Design an enzyme around this catalytic site. Sequence first.
Site, PDB file in Angstrom:
ATOM      1  N   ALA A 162       0.834  -1.184   0.000  1.00  0.00           N
ATOM      2  CA  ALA A 162       0.000   0.000   0.000  1.00  0.00           C
ATOM      3  C   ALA A 162       0.876   1.243   0.000  1.00  0.00           C
ATOM      4  O   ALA A 162       2.048   1.210   0.376  1.00  0.00           O
ATOM      5  CB  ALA A 162      -0.920   0.019   1.213  1.00  0.00           C
ATOM      6  N   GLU A 168      -1.290  -9.732  -0.472  1.00  0.00           N
ATOM      7  CA  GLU A 168      -2.706  -9.953  -0.210  1.00  0.00           C
ATOM      8  C   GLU A 168      -3.517  -9.953  -1.503  1.00  0.00           C
ATOM      9  O   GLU A 168      -4.488 -10.707  -1.633  1.00  0.00           O
ATOM     10  CB  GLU A 168      -3.196  -8.890   0.776  1.00  0.00           C
ATOM     11  N   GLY A 228       0.324  -5.384   0.719  1.00  0.00           N
ATOM     12  CA  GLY A 228      -0.931  -5.419  -0.007  1.00  0.00           C
ATOM     13  C   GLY A 228      -0.848  -6.228  -1.285  1.00  0.00           C
ATOM     14  O   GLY A 228      -1.829  -6.870  -1.683  1.00  0.00           O
ATOM     15  N   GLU A 232       4.285  -5.248   6.842  1.00  0.00           N
ATOM     16  CA  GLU A 232       3.519  -4.219   7.544  1.00  0.00           C
ATOM     17  C   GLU A 232       3.971  -4.067   8.995  1.00  0.00           C
ATOM     18  O   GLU A 232       3.955  -2.955   9.539  1.00  0.00           O
ATOM     19  CB  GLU A 232       2.028  -4.550   7.489  1.00  0.00           C
TER      20      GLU A 232
END
Lengths: 178, 370, 1098
Positions: free
Chosen positions: C212, C262, C259, C282
Amino acid sequence: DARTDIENFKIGVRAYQQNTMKPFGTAVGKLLRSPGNPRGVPDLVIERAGQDTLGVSTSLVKPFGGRVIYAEEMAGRRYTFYAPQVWTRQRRIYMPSAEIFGTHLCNAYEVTMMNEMVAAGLLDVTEPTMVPWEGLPEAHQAMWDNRHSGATYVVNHALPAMGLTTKDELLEYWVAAQ
Amino acid sequence: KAFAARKTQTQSWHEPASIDLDAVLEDEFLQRILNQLEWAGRDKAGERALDAVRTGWTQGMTAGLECEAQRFAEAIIDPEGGKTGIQQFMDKQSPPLPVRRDGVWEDDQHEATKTALIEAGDLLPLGAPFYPGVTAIPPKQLAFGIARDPDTGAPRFGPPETHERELVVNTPKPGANEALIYLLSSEVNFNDIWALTGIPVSPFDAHDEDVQITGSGGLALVAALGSELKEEGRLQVGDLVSVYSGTSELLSPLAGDDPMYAGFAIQGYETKTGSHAQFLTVQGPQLHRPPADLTLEQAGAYTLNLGTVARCLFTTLEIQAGKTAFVEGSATGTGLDALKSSVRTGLAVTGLVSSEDRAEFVKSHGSVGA
Amino acid sequence: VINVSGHRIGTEEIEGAILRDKALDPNSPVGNVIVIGAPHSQKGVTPIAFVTPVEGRRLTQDDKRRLTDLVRTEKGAVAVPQDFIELSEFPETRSGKYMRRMVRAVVEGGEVLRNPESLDELARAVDGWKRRQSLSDTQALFERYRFFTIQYNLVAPGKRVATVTVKNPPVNALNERALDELVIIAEHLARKDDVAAVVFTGSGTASFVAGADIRQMLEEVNSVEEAKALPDNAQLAFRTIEEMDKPCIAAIQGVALGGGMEFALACHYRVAEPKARFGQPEINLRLLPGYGGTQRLPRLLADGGGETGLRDALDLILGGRAIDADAALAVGAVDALADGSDNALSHAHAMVREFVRSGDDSALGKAFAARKTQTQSWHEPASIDLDAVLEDEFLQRILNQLEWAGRDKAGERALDAVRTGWTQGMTAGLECEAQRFAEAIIDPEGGKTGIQQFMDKQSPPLPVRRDGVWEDDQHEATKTALIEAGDLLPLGAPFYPGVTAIPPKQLAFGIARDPDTGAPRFGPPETHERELVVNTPKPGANEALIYLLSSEVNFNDIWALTGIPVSPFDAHDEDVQITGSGGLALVAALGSELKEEGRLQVGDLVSVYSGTSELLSPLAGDDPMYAGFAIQGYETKTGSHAQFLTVQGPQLHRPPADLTLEQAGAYTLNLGTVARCLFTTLEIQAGKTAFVEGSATGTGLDALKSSVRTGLAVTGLVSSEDRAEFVKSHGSVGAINRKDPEIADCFTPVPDDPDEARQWEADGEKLLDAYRETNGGKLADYVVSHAGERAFPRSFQLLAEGGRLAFYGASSGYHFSFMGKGGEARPDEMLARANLRGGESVLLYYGPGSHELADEKGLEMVEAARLMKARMVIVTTSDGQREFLQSLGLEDAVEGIVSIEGLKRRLSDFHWPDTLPRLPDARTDIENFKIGVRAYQQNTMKPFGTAVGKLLRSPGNPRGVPDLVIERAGQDTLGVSTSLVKPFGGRVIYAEEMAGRRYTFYAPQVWTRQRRIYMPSAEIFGTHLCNAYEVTMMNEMVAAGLLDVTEPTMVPWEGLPEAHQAMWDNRHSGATYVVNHALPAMGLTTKDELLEYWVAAQ
Ligand SMILES: NC(=O)c1ccc[n+]([C@@H]2O[C@H](COP(=O)([O-])OP(=O)(O)OC[C@H]3O[C@@H](n4cnc5c(N)ncnc54)[C@H](OP(=O)(O)O)[C@@H]3O)[C@@H](O)[C@H]2O)c1
Ligand SMILES: NC(=O)c1ccc[n+]([C@@H]2O[C@H](COP(=O)([O-])OP(=O)(O)OC[C@H]3O[C@@H](n4cnc5c(N)ncnc54)[C@H](OP(=O)(O)O)[C@@H]3O)[C@@H](O)[C@H]2O)c1
């Protein structure tokens, strides 16, 4: 000439190499042998104006930057050499008042420099004469006969229209043509 | 396991084989060879060979080996055998060998093979759209060049307009440092002709293939990348690229000097395959990003002629502005690229032509004369 | 007046802005302009700009792009022409007036007499244009979103495949808008029965999706409502992909991180490139996986690997470290790898093809039906005991490290999400994960701190990977255990290439990260350089595996071992660093492409060159050193201080045969650097004088002997009389003891006060007297410097008039200084010296020290550069100086002007230093040294380079970097100019009297990038190592005797740490050190003598 009589041309090239260059280079090579020069090849030849051995010297001097020099007056005399030996191996001949530098294609870094100049305007890409896939043999023959229809030929493999300028235009026109 | 198996294999070779040697010899291609041997003066050697084959095949390897050695010794001292064949090979005057089974190109069967392969998904039509990453890479392709005569094995050299033929060849697979590219266009260079004609050197002498495809440059799309090109991360499947034709020993220490001096060779002219084809394999540094403002016809048109002129003028001659320059063939190809390039560099360029039209043409490109 | 999408705009307003090019550029190709509103499918009306060019001029695409930004900056992006149509002429009337209506009528197709035939040329151009617009509006191949592109392709008569490509250019990070688009894309493609399958991938070669947007979570999320949108939007897209009724493949061509991992997990099948890496970092920001990582990763890996799978998933979340693609496939995080010439995207489409042709019998159909079952089971409670797995001893070492690094509350949040879904089902976990993620972002002790630390380069280390634990207690016990089996050869063991099996483990010297904290165990070599057990490498296609007999002992090893001034761990992601740049080895294995080359062979005796580069780059033909260069062992993860090593083909060389085995692998780094320094950079000539630093050891000695052998009058710098004698015994004209009390105190940098500086220069008078007394009245024509901050200024002061200094290091410090040398020259001549070429980009400082608008010399410099056809940017001090120049008609020369005053107005934190700001020594204070450098970059270079670049951007220089800088003697901005000018040959030139002034720059900016400085009476050229062709020339000269290898001081394997420390303290027991790995005796000269002495020993 290799066109009109190639079988006898190849024999003459081989005799030159076998009875002149190989025996002469061997003998020179045995004396130039050293840890720095195992094969004993001259980096530079000092030719002499009073003879016409330039072909041998250009053929013996190292490839790729091998140099032959003249210092004496060459006026009123003819000299000779085998063209491929100078350009394809890019050898250099320095004479008192003249120089002949062989040059052959380019390396990939010079291409990037070239395209840098094309981008900057310093160089200009001649617009090719476009030819269909089927017209390639004719384009080759037209070059061979010196009957060029334009400056330089390009064969179309799969360009759907002329004037396109981006990859996305190419792909877009392809799906549209179906 | 391998030594024990081979042990039983050899001892079975000492007994007559259970395969019909005479039947297989009825093969149309094995007959094509025999007639080729007759044509090339090796028919006697062929007889001696098949004698030892046949002898050992029916009387055991022992009886064959004994026979093979006698024929071999006879063939050597034979004035019409080795004394002729070896001298011929050593004087570089040997007739060509026949082609391989997978190397038979016959004119009358081309269009049928083309259309049949296109009926299957085995060959894309010429001009076919190709979306990298999506379209299945065909196993076969079309291309221009020269092939060895199926009957004699000799390269079918000749004038381009009658001898440069469209052929069905294989699509190449890239090595670890190579890309596979789908060609949108190809440069039409004079080295194509020297090869197609065989003047003054046969391109077949630099490789062991039964076909030669010329072509040095053009515009292409990246179709695939070898493992190391993907590691480099410079190129990418789907990139629009122009082709540079030079190939070298990219792994040599001498590369720091000049790749031109590290086992250099021009593709298409001094290699088995070239850009006059649908697909081509190239080394990484053969592929370049075209200048953006060029048209697609322009992008794949100039890298050979203009690259050579660039090295000639700026590297070799190191031309100085304001000086005079005399160019041959100033109205076409490299001569024109040199004319134009020297003018732009600031020189007083004079050109050589063979027609008054060409003289006016070069004067419109900024020459002081023609 | 045209109505561009409800925006009322006058055509005259647009025309005028286009015509401004003529007022700004006296050489503008624009002549006349007419703007028409052409019918547009959606915009309703769109402005088209018809322009006639100046006689002889053409309207390049660079022109249209400039005339486009011209209306933008003048009126507004709404009043921008969609296209620029060139014409030969306009409808002119009797007197010359332009018939706007005639043009409007044709463009609009309406009914247009009083004028010439131009009218035909318009229609032709309008026709051509109206058709390109039809194709744009009808094409169904590409759908173009802001951060995505969808490419549709027909697979079967009623089945299209869809290629969704992410494109946010630095790393394809997902910011909020990309999540917004990705939701729409997933929902749309899901409803299109037209679409049989979906392939997601990322553009570029670097990253699929690397996470992200980190800056956005810090600067644009100041409430929970804002925060919750990022999981809620991201999870919805990923749930849509997961629950879709079509196979969705992730074709991972780069890294998939955070991200992006994911994103991939949401897909039904995953095929990746072997170069892709995977992880969940993260936690490094005191966040946690928030887009489904705490559910789909432990669920996916646990289904594949039972209890261990869950453990492995907790490693990735809590540890936050990335894994290679082989490990991702093994643990079950990806399903296939694209080997060979296969690639992720093509592989994926081939699976779609086999799925359209075979349906559920295809591998993709089975994977899709299998995943369906798999997803629904994740919505039920998992069967594995989580609390039990968290009792694993390594998971505890992670938890203890999070507390040490301030990430324990982030770990607690992640386990909460993991545990919530593991017991209550994915849906409950995804709700809790989303909330905890948003809570961590706004948390002042969470995201707000973690992200800040990460961006400012102040994050503590992450833990080491489970496989990267080096504990000293275990070493000797593990070494023996492995040796007793067939897995590790004893050190010095014979190795017969092509015969001896290759052990999987090996011994080496290096640095490992601390298994408790993850911090590299940097320290003094004799105490911290340790023997470790590591893996025997496997060579790539272009690589070789070698068995090292000896190893070069060089200073760069020490810089790496001590992590000064840079950590070697910042350039890789391994838990262990191994140094070693060169040596002697045998060839043990060759990759496919080195066997094709034919040059090397298994069994060859070779010496190792330490340079590595992008062999496949087109820029190789220039200089490998300028094509992604990196020194092995120092700037790469492994080195020659080990039993086995992998190298590029060009690293392996045939040693001169007349050398002994001790010498062979002992000199390449040093003498090679000395070779490029002397013969390539300085181009030393016989009969000149030369001054060589550290002449008694290492590179200095190599330079001394080589300069003596080329016929120079070399004097050597020296710290003990015993070394001065040693140097004199090598054919030198003299030596100097820098420690002698008569001159010792003068070897210092140049103070800031200009008056102290000039006194400092006087205080070196005794030094120059010493040099001159030994060189017949002359000063040094050449200088070789490497000591650094505390010797460079004096070494430069020793230069003669017109001399040339080179340097390749700076051991005392990188803060270089020097008092300028008398002499003035013409800008003309100086640009000639620097080989200024037409088309190169030039930077020129105007009004360097003052606010007075008159700078006569500054204008002379502009004129000089202009006459050589240079793309110029001028930097003034004030706006008045900029406006002064704007009335001199320099538009044909300068591409733009910027004032330091103006940048300070627009950028609060822009700093223009009078001189290189001094930093604390990294030795003393590392962290504050790192803080000061990035302040320079962020507050000085990055702003000042951006402003300059935007004015130098051109096709020939897309990134707008200066090829050369015209400096000014009246200021001390040399640190900026040397940092800005392009690397690899960039040049700065002075043309004014520099006498009596100080000039400062950062050492590595000049030497490591080999930039050159030209001055009227002196020259400072940076040099660095050498390329592999220069090595062939070195050994060539060695064999020929033109160069001499100094006998190495051999030390045993166990002595390498002491040997390194001896170099550090200047306590040398010889000239250079070499460590022996498997040489059985000294004096051997052949490979067959090596193998025969081995058998004699066993
Ligand atoms: N070493 C390399 O890397 C390299 C690279 C490119 C090309 N080449 C070679 O350079 C040559 C030219 O190639 P190209 O692409 O420029 O071919 P091109 O476009 O066909 O032009 C060849 C030019 O040669 C001129 N010409 C023919 N006979 C001539 C003669 N007796 N005297 C003077 N001029 C003559 C012609 O011009 P006019 O009739 O008007 O006088 C003609 O335009 C070829 O042999 C090619 O193989 C070598
Ligand atoms: N750019 C490159 O590729 C490259 C390559 C190799 C080396 N280097 C660097 O160059 C430097 C030397 O390398 P090396 O192998 O030659 O190391 P070395 O063998 O340890 O010798 C370095 C010499 O520098 C002298 N020295 C130390 N402090 C000095 C000072 N304040 N003033 C003057 N001289 C001083 C010493 O001689 P005295 O104390 O007796 O005067 C010492 O012998 C290192 O920093 C190295 O990192 C760079």
